[PDB]
Amino acid sequence: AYRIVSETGDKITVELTLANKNTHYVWNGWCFDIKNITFETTGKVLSIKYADGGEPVYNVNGNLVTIDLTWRGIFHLNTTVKIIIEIQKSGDNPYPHNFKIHYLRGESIIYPTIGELPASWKPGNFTLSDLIADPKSYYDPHVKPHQNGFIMYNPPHPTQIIIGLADIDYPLNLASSARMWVPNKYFAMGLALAYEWFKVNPNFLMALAAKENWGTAVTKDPAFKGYKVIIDEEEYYWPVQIDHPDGIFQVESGNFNQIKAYYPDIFPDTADHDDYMKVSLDPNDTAWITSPIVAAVSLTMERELLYAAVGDKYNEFLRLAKDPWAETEIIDFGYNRGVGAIEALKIFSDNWEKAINAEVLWKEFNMEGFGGHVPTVINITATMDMETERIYDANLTWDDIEYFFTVVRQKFFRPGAISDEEWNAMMRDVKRAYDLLSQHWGGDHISYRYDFLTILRVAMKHWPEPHIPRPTGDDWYYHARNYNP
């Protein structure tokens, strides 16, 4: 909020008040991290100072003034900052106007729409038609191959989840061959939520787990001792280290600690690394659900950090790069070698031309990662994307769905984001949607492939908006302001 304090002589004095007025947690408003504040004037800036002493930094570019709050840019609950701006009147638009708070978060970040519930849908007594816009398309088994990498910009179907269980000819982790597989349906539901929530391609998370710890692939390579898995009367080895505390995505505790700090809206303060990541042979281990969501948030963090640092240049890079897998390569490299290692490449500054002209970015920039990480993950994602013959599907029962959302409620969001009443109303709608969708299959289950995205969308109609919160807080602030990739 802002106010003319006085206009006296040719001197215009304005007070700007910046605050987080929240006194208790609310969704997306627990902390605001301010990159800068802009405003316009044709007058001459005489001084910009804090009301309670000291002054921010500012610069003028034509009619555009940019205030940098430097050490004072972080706004926790109940925090107010008052700024006094003095202008010498001149020109045709001298009063400070068009104030914009710019958060430390790329304003142009692209989060694609995968699909949407029919516009006629409303909570409570919706009907089957309120769920399924176009039945012929909804149940169509024909698979359209695609080439999405990390982010699903061009989903092959708006309501179907297509995990391609392709045979892999690439030498995965030095095995002669592999086959992708989904260890259980609770894991599959976690992938689906990562997809619908953060727009991450399930095939990319599948590929990533396979490289990191064989989480999602088996092999006939007899060099590769592992658990025995029989799949339609053929013996495979599953070379996963299933009790590894970092899980099938190999997320370490330092990275977990950091994304917890960045995402108070996603992680409660109780969230613990081994509890969220460490799976086991038991399909009921809750980490089968939480760990693909954690991996998706970790990947999301890299993308969000890049956007926060380079703004509009990020989409310009996506438009211009000659390597169509460039973004996916950068994000996978950063996952394995860290965002410091991305930053050192200087793709978005010093080495821009070389980067956008590279036919294979990772070869030009030596961004393999350890153990052929980048080419492996990219090759497997591409192979899965092309798969049409063998697509994952599973029967989900009401108990499965109920269990899934209980775990989500236990492990994600913070108290105050969704009330008990809201959660209960959400679960009535989810159960009703399950009941209507089950009828197509004989009433005893719904389909993971055909129905589960619609179930998620019904649930998410009740989630706080916007569904993807900003990364925020003190650590994010200093890290993203000092990041120059």
Ligand X SMILES: CC(=O)N[C@@H]1[C@@H](O)[C@H](O[C@@H]2O[C@H](CO)[C@@H](O)[C@H](O)[C@H]2NC(C)=O)[C@@H](CO)O[C@@H]1O
Contacted entry of its own copies, ligand X, none for residue 336, CB cut-off 5 to 8 Å set by kind:
ligand X
Q: Which of 4, 5, 174, 281 binds ligand X (CB under 6 A)?
A: 174
Q: How far is the CB of 261 from ligand X (least distance, A)?
A: 22
- Please say which residue, 463 or 478, places its beta carbon nearer to its own copies: 478
Least Cβ distance, residue 69 to its own copies (angstroms):
14
Q: Between 179 and 260, whose beta carbon lies closer to its own copies?
A: 260
Tokens linked to 303: 């993308």
Q: Which is nearer to its own copies, 155 or 247 (CB)?
A: 247
Select the span of 121-129, 263-271, 318-326, 420-428 touching its own copies (CB under 8 A).
263-271
Window contacting its own copies (CB under 8 A); options: 32-40, 150-158, 173-181, 246-254: 246-254
Q: Which of 86, 364, 402, 475 binds its own copies (CB under 8 A)?
A: 475
Task: Give the residue with the Cβ less far from its own copies, 267 or 404.
Answer: 267
Question: Can residue 214 be called a binding residue for ligand X (CB under 6 A)?
Answer: yes
Is residue 474 a contact residue for its own copies (CB under 8 A)? yes
Residues 228-247 that bind ligand X (CB under 6 A): 239, 241, 244
CA 471 to chain centre: 10
Nearer to its own copies, 268 or 464 (CB): 268
CB of 135 to its own copies, least distance (A): 46
Binding mask 358-397 for ligand X (x = CB under 6 A): ------------xxxx------------------------
Beta pairing class for 74-76 and 64-68: unpaired
- Cα 216 to the chain's mean position, in Å? 21
**Residues 146, 179, 185, 260: which binds its own copies (CB under 8 A)?**
260
134 binds, among its own copies, ligand X, none (CB under 5 to 8 A by kind): none
Q: Which does 373 bind (CB under 5 to 8 A by kind): ligand X, its own copies, none?
A: ligand X
- Partner interacting with residue 212 (select from ligand X, its own copies, none; CB below 5-8 Å by kind): ligand X
The token pair that represents 363 in the structure block = 């070869």
- Based on its alpha-carbon atoms, the radius of gyration of the chain, rounded to whole angstroms, reads 25
Q: Which residues bind ligand X (CB under 6 A)?
A: 173-174, 212-214, 239, 241, 244, 250, 336, 370-373
Q: Which residues bind its own copies (CB under 8 A)?
A: 71, 241, 243-246, 252-258, 260-261, 269-275, 338-341, 343-344, 370, 474-475, 478-479, 482-483
